[PDB]
Amino acid sequence: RTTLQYPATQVSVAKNLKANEPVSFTYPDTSSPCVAVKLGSPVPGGVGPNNDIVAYSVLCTHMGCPTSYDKSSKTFKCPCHFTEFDAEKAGQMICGQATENLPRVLLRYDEASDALTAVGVDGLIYGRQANVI
Amino acid sequence: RTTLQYPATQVSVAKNLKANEPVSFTYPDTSSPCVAVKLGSPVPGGVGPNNDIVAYSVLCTHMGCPTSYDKSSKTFKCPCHFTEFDAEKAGQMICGQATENLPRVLLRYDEASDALTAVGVDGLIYGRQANVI
Amino acid sequence: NDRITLPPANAQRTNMTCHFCIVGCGYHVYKWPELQEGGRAPEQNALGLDFRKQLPPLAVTLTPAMTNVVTEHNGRRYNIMVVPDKACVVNSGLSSTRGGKMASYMYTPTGDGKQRLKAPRLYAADQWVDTTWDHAMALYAGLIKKTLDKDGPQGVFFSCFDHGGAGGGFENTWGTGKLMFSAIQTPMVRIHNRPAYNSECHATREMGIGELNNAYEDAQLADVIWSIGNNPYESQTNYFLNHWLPNLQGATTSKKKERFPNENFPQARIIFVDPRETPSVAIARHVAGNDRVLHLAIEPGTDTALFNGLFTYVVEQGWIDKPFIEAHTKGFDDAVKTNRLSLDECSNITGVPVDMLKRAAEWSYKPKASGQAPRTMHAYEKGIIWGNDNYVIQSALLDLVIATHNVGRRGTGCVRMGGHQEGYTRPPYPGDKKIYIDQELIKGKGRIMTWWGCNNFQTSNNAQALREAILQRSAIVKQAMQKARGATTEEMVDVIYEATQNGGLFVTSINLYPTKLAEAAHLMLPAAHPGEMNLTSMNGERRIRLSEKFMDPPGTAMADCLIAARIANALRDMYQKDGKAEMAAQFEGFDWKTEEDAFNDGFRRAGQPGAPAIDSQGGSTGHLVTYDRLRKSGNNGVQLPVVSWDESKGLVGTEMLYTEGKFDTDDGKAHFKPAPWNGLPATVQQQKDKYRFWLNNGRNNEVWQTAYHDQYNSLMQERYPMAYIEMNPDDCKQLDVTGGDIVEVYNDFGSTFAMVYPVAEIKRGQTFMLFGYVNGIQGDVTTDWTDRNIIPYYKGTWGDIRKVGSMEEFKRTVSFKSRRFA
Amino acid sequence: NDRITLPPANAQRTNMTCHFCIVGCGYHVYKWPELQEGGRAPEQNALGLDFRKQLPPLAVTLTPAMTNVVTEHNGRRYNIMVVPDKACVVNSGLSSTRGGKMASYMYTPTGDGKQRLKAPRLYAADQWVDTTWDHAMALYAGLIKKTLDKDGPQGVFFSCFDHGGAGGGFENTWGTGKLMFSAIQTPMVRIHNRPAYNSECHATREMGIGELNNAYEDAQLADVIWSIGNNPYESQTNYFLNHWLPNLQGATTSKKKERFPNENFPQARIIFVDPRETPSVAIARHVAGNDRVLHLAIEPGTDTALFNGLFTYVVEQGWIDKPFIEAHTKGFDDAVKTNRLSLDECSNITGVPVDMLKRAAEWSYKPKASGQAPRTMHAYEKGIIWGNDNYVIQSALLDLVIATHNVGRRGTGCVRMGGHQEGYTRPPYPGDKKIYIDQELIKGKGRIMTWWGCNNFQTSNNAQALREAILQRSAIVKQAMQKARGATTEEMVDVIYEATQNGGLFVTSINLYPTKLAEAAHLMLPAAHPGEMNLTSMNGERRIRLSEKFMDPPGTAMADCLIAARIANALRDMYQKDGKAEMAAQFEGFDWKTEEDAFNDGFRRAGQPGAPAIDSQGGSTGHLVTYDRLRKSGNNGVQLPVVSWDESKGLVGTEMLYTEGKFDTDDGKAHFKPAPWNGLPATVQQQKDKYRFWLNNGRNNEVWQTAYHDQYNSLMQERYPMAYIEMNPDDCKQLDVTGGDIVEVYNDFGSTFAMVYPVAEIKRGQTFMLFGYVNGIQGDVTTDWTDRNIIPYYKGTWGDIRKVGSMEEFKRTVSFKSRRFA
Ligand SMILES: Nc1nc2c(c(=O)[nH]1)N[C@H]1C(S)=C(S)[C@@H](COP(=O)(O)OP(=O)(O)OC[C@H]3O[C@@H](n4cnc5c(=O)[nH]c(N)nc54)[C@H](O)[C@@H]3O)O[C@H]1N2
Ligand SMILES: Nc1nc2c(c(=O)[nH]1)N[C@H]1C(S)=C(S)[C@@H](COP(=O)(O)OP(=O)(O)OC[C@H]3O[C@@H](n4cnc5c(=O)[nH]c(N)nc54)[C@H](O)[C@@H]3O)O[C@H]1N2
Ligand code: F3S
Ligand code: F3S
Ligand code: FES
Ligand code: FES
Ligand SMILES: [Cl-]
Ligand SMILES: [Cl-]
Ligand SMILES: [Cl-]
Ligand SMILES: [Mo+4]
Ligand SMILES: [Mo+4]
Ligand SMILES: [O]
Ligand SMILES: [O]
């Protein structure tokens, strides 16, 4: 087998998320903090009724300091060496010292239940040999 | 873990091999036929005292028909769709329908014992999802 | 790498015809999320194969190069796997080395497709920069409009594909042909492989025999197959493998006997007409034995003499079909007189011994014991199409074929083997003159020249003269553009147009990649290839299939028919704004949102009530074909022309043409033609008198065309880092060259370079150089000579050879071992 | 993807200095067989880290871009991992985004380095082909020999690196210098970044202060740091992060107080002299607070007025070191007179308010309560090096620094921040004039021009005039070559030489990649970068380190010093054949088999018995350095000059220069200089008067230099598909442009293009464009003006801006969010 065994972790239902109010959760284990946010306007690869829900690992891909979500810019900021990632451009590094974009947590949106589920990660989370330890 | 677990399989001792007289052996299991040959003149990545011992999987990488070693040309030949691989250029396809060079069986030569050991494979053997089933 | 990710049982699967050669082998594309995989058990993967233990041989064709991970415009990543369809009748699960790379040649940001064009590129006097599609359109349409308003359509030049498959197909030939011919109305149009708007097959067509007149199944039913100017193992691989060889091996004898209960079928035999001993001749001998292969190793350019000798001989023996001749032909008695040539003279001209000429004729034409003429399929390609007088060689050949009734019977045909796939639907060419486009550009004609899905820098005849002239004329435009500062588009259009009045030429390329054309181009627009778009095309037996879109193109790359629509609509808007209603109306009819709209407008309207004049390989029953109906037919598609469609039977087509003896002429009879023997053209004979080597040229199995993808592929570049030239080993010793030396190859027309490839089978004074390549362009030494219809004698040139030096890295890394399977 | 292969515990590990900027951070390269890996337990992998559970933050810098799989010449495949060294004092385990990509930018046939030059390339009139090294040398040496024989050295031109790190270093600068100056003896040589053979630091050097006079530790000991014409977070990242910021944070206060038990150390402060508000100003404010940062947002080109006002003011206040002045300086009383400027006049010229000027002075120069003058480190870079009259600004600044005794005390220095690493060992320049090389080529001088490890097409000042001229002159040679048929090398040398008497120029590039220079070059030679070779270099505190070879170069690529020896030996052999002993003797001394030979011949011979004249940053104690001794010193290396070596203590070096007040002048005193304020140069003022926007230009954190590697990296191409121009949002509204629009930027000197990047912090009527880039070259709009020593005012230019159009794909894919951390 070539793929990691990622869990399927319920985050919430889409209608409970408020625009630009981030939700904290862990994925794919309790040592991997993540954020999901309804951006309020469609972005490529956004899920949900408005194609605007995205999620990321919040560990800085430079040296692992937890980033904080900035509501006014819709960015994740690392104040250790000042790396900034764009939540609206799939974690694109705006300016900083990282060499990988912020890893995206892949969300399934289920219209029948309204459920958002974390099902994978695109990119390698800081400080691990594999996403699934 | 990212690597396959290849066995360490004794082939023979280097001094027992005669120039251009191929030795059949299976690696990395009894369903994967291979050939080792002391070419007589050095080639890059040849092993042994004269840097001229090489080994290959003999299953054609096009559609798996077993190839035959041609002593006079130092090539492996597939008579199903006529692919031919150069034993002196790491399995380079000379002409044919395959899209992969002939897989090389990585050989350790042990000066202390004269032993030749198959220890991995460079390339994917025909007809398997991974080299180690 | 030492494993592969299997497709899940439920993976998406679409159909894909091979991008590349005429055969048009069937493939499946499996697509699934990057992080999923199938299980090894057969019912847990999409291939249905059991990977819990070693697979037997022939069970699959699957390597890492047949897989990739693509990234869509939404940022989602998907595994793909592109593998041959076992149930497709064309290939029966076979994949050539060229089609087997398709997955690797799909666009990804990090792989072999990294350098794909993905935005419009502009050379803004002295640098390449990105530009917007709207600015590109304003410039390009602006310059075409200005030209049309001042000079007329004669100032607007194109060289454009007319073929099928990738960078072709019914949607794309229609879009471009509607644009060029119906909207702009320019006659200054050449074709990707030839320098005027003409046909490879004027003679056979005028004689009433379209060049794709049989089914691949006929190669299974033949008694004898002729391969004339053709290396089909390398150039039409899976037709040769899946149909020709099973005949040679005796696997199709029962099918012949079932069809024809009162006919003898001896062991099948094969005759090659080729000055060169090729891998195809070696493999045929391996499979059939020496006694069942005849290699007529003619002198270069002597095909006409060969066929006139054979025609004269069969007529003298009575090994012809006198009732067929009387009932279904015209001009036989005249051809017997014009084409008379004795076997001794035939032998002297061609160098083939009289005993081999007689044997060829006895195998192919002398009645079998049971009374019937042998079923002899005559297949030909570029050794005669680009031979010494295209029109005359076909005339001679078809005379022989018609007299012997080897069209219209099963197991026969006189057919092109083909190059690309086919997929032609266009308006008629808008003039009545034959115009040698290269020569016009070299002489300084035209304001704007667009290369569209071709690269004549690598592929023109007399290519060095062309490149030199295009580089020079392009530099005039570059120089004029540099002085501009803050120019509006209109002002830039004027600066450029003025430079073209002083010898300049604005150059646009519409392509997948920059190519060597980027050395001269001012503008490059990004195109999309099958799988990034839907596409239709037919193979060498007219079998039309749909290749299904399964991924996004890179950046803003677009289907070629939609680029043509974009240009037409930009021109229409400009004429409407300028108050020119009559010119705006010429650009109507391009309201297209997707490629299917182009299929509906062209292929599906041919011959329909109210449609304009449309020349279409689908004919007037083309409307019966739709994307959904092709989808349902699968990779077996339907052989054109379609005879009927209904829900219960699908598309029903046509296996073989001319089976009733009714040909495509005014009277329904095939017409014999005179075939004079004139020797080599004087232009070519002059090079031959001055220089030592025949500079034969053509294909290598592994390399596709101009190597537009292959140039980025590490395996390809390791194997063929430079174009190679096969040379006789005694000739090599005389020149003190061996495998991996570099030589200059030159004559009066040009100079180029190749790595030496000693080959025992090459005749003294002859060579063979890989054509079209990215490092050492063969066409520099080809002449300007063309036949009556401007068909070049690309295989007709002589030159000298001079050692440059030993390339130690080639000696270290490239195999110079024999490519002819013993 | 989602995992990495760990290095086995017993993996090979070598030392490597970052390839790129001046800081010279330390790295380790782990190399091991492709098919092996380390275990997750800390003692089972070479990193010693525990991958059985999540790592804490700061434990490691490790992403997939920091790994690769290389293929050596023998065909064997090796994992590599290139990660920062925790124990290196320069970086303490930090990696920038540029260094962090090193593994990705090592050569592999399938990766970012796939298009590396692998073989000599020859433009044979109208096409690129491979050629042999021996044929390349026969043509290149042939032309140089004919030029020397007929015109002398003045017909042989170079633009060559003079720097350290990758594409530089002590081996390489010596090899090239010896070839150019001792062997060929040409004075027609410019430098990679400036168009004559000159220094960035003529003034500070002639005043007795070499520009790298301190240690990085000094930034930790300072009370105040000035950053003048410098954006150190983006351009000297790990020096700013590892030394500057810890001082601002209070983490080094204890070190200061331990060193100086009777001295007050207030919280550290930072002063930026930069017209533009940069990410460095933003981060400094973030870390220190607004009250501890002054941004002196001067008008462009007013640095001299600023420093003259400040000098005048500290002298009027008595905030100078009179005993230091009296004992160790000359010229102060004169400088006080010539440089007199009131704070009101200073404020008028610069635009900086009087209160901020007084504040900057009070923080930096007013004695502390405990009596000692503040320890104020003055760091400057290209904002003044390429500013309004390089010589004068340095005169002004050094006057201030000298009067205030801010050189030679710990926590002080007046220093270059640096660009590349340093690694200069060369013979003296063989002329007495400064020659503006680009102007000479534009005017039609020279026969042969070699670009060696630089690309002035992207980086010259007045770049558009240079490219236009080179492309023209090159085409003349191309045209003349096209008529050749079967020419010997001697005949081709003669053809080319004759084209150069008619306006032509033969162009050679010696490089890692084709680059835009491939648009004009006739010959390209493949070079090798650190890791494919051993290489020595020093960082901005003179710390020399050995970067170790760990893999093969691609194909036949070679270390630049060994290319130089190959050229020299080819020329020697030619002269010997031609019976010219005296000329052949000039080409002696290149019997080199490895790069270490060049280190021994150059760096290690400086000042030694029997050595020729050698200018070396190692000085006359360089011979104490050897590869083995550096290897034992590790990535900490030694700070030059070396003071002693022995087996028991290793290499012992020098932390700070000028600590006894003895300077590099005739009398050992620092010399004050006059710094007249003349306003902007007329050539620049003329652009300013005609056009609207100040066209500032420089570095972006992510992009390295000309983007020679970055252009192939999919992440970098996603982020910065085109060069960007920072614009004020109100100016944007007025032009109807927003993020992702394309603009033309133009003046009398040229026209270029950029994508718009609205930036709130940019002042109205100012802009900032990325320099040197592969899509939209900034330098087209820089003027030809240079100072008295031919140092260009690259930051001094004005132009207009015009909307081309909206690039929807840029809007869709590129972030235009603020790069200034709030
Ligand atoms: N592998 C591969 N396959 C391809 C292509 C590719 O690029 N690569 N390209 C495709 C295209 S577009 C085309 S047109 C076809 C071409 O397919 P072919 O025409 O089969 O291939 P060529 O190598 O051009 O030439 C065929 C033979 O013509 C012979 N020849 C030369 N001069 C003469 C002559 O005077 N008389 C005769 N009788 N023979 C002569 C040559 O020795 C050669 O073996 O292949 C298609 N298939
Ligand atoms: N990320 C990255 N780092 C690099 C490089 C790279 O390409 N990328 N290249 C390296 C090289 S070779 C060099 S030389 C250095 C350059 O390092 P720096 O000189 O720090 O970088 P620049 O961006 O060229 O210019 C610095 C500042 O000068 C300011 N400036 C412009 N005009 C004036 C003026 O008239 N007076 C004053 N005081 N300031 C002015 C600009 O606003 C800019 O912020 O960086 C090196 N480091
Ligand atoms: S795989 Fe492709 S190249 Fe021809 S032989 Fe089949 S269509
Ligand atoms: S990693 Fe490299 S780019 Fe400079 S900051 Fe350090 S030397
Ligand atoms: S740990 Fe986030 S920028 Fe360094
Ligand atoms: S199975 Fe070997 S060539 Fe096809
Ligand atoms: Cl493969
Ligand atoms: Cl990464
Ligand atoms: Cl002269
Ligand atoms: Mo063709
Ligand atoms: Mo610099
Ligand atoms: O063709
Ligand atoms: O620099």
Author numbering:
A (entry chain B), B (entry chain D): 1 to 133
C (entry chain C), D (entry chain A): 4 to 825
Q: Which text from the study accompanies this structure?
A:
Arsenite oxidase (Aio) is an ancient bioenergetic enzyme present in microbes since the early stages of life on Earth, with its origin dated prior to the evolutionary split of Archaea and Bacteria. Aio belongs to the dimethyl sulfoxide reductase family of molybdopterin (Moco)-dependent enzymes, with the Mo atom coordinated by two molybdopterin guanine dinucleotides (MGD). The large subunit, AioA, contains the catalytic Moco and one [3Fe-4S] cluster, while the smaller subunit, AioB, harbors a Rieske [2Fe-2S] cluster. The enzyme catalyzes the 2-electron oxidation of AsIII as well as of SbIII, albeit with pronounced differences in reaction kinetics: SbIII salts are oxidized around 6500 times slower than the corresponding AsIII salt.
In this structure, the Sb atom is sitting vertically to Mo and coordinated to the oxo ligand (Mo-Ox-Sb) and to four additional oxo/hydroxo groups (O1, O2, O3, and O4). Sb-O distances are ∼2 Å and Sb is ∼3.5 Å from the Mo, closer to the MGD-P dithiolene. In contrast to the Aio_d intermediates, where the two bridging oxygens (O1 and Ox) are equidistant to Mo, in Aio-Sb_e, the Mo-O1 distance is too long to be considered a covalent bond (range 2.6–3.2 Å). In this case, as in structure Af Aio-As_c, Mo is pentacoordinated, adopting a trigonal prismatic geometry.
